[PDB]
Amino acid sequence: KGEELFTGVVPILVELDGDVNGHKFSVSGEGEGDATYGKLTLKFISTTGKLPVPWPTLVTTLVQCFARYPDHMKRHDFFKSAMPEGYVQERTIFFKDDGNYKTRAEVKFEGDTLVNRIELKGIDFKEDGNILGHKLEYNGWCGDNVYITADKQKNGIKANFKIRHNIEDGGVQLADHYQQNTPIGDGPVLLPDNHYLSTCSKLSKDPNEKRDHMVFLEFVTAAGI
Structure with missing residues (x-):
């Protein structure tokens, strides 16, 4: 099964x-x-200089197949069921009173490696706003539970959740995520009952890293059934 690919x-x-x-x-x-632990340890670097947007705004875009689905919920794990062929993950992220990201990604195995290739398009961002102006705290932000629902029409799922970024000096910048995932292959997938993913993240910096970067720790676990 697809989950057997995530045993270790x-x-x-x-x-x-x-x-x-x-x-x-x-x-x-x-x-x-x-x-097994819903644990992700990742490091990201910009290869094109200082990013024009804050790192926290890119976290959700930068592999929910690594969520821990407890034994009693494994029947609802669409992400792993679509492996190894993978799935397309598309999102529209509306930053309140600011621009929006539109993202399209392929999450699939290349050899023994899980790969996430993303194309992101952002428009209508305010130069004097919280995003382009880099006013979002690096760790001052909390992510609501990722509420997942089946999308039988496209043999996939949909997700909705808000990210709440603390603004430096006060305030919160909301990011409304609208998500859709579709399998790349034709094989049968797991169409889940309503549930959600609980997420916990920590951003940090590598003192040796010379490029604009983000060290990333995340725990993501399924619940709600």
């Missing part, structure tokens, strides 16, 4: 080609995931 530690590679208000950037990430 799996290496991860991430690639993101971004474009925000016509300003292009590129991020390369790598690390490992341990679905």
Whole structure:
């Protein structure tokens, strides 16, 4: 089964080609995931200089197949069921009173490595706003539970959740996520009952890293059934 591919530690590679208000950037990430613990340890670097947007706004875009689905919920794990062929993950992220990200990604196995290749398009961002102005706290932000629902029409799922970024000096910048995932292959997948993913993240910095970067720790676990 697809879940058998996640029994141990799996290496991860991430690639993101971004474009925000016509300003292009590129991020390369790598690390490992341990679905048994819903644990992700990843590091991301910008290869194109300082990012035009804050790192926290890219976290959700930069591998939910590593969520821990407890034994009693494994029937509802769409992400692993679509492996190894993978799935397309599309999102529209509305930043309240600001621009929006539109993202399309392929999450699939290349060899023994889980790969996440992303194309991101951002438009309508305010130069004097919280995003382009880099006013979002690096760890001052909390992510609501990722509420997942089946999308039988497309043999996939949909997800909805808000990310709440603390603004430096006060305030919260909301990011409304609208998500859709579709399998790449034709094989049968697991269409889940309503549930959610509980997430916990920690951003940090590598003191040896010279490039604009983000060290990333995440725990993600399924619940709600």
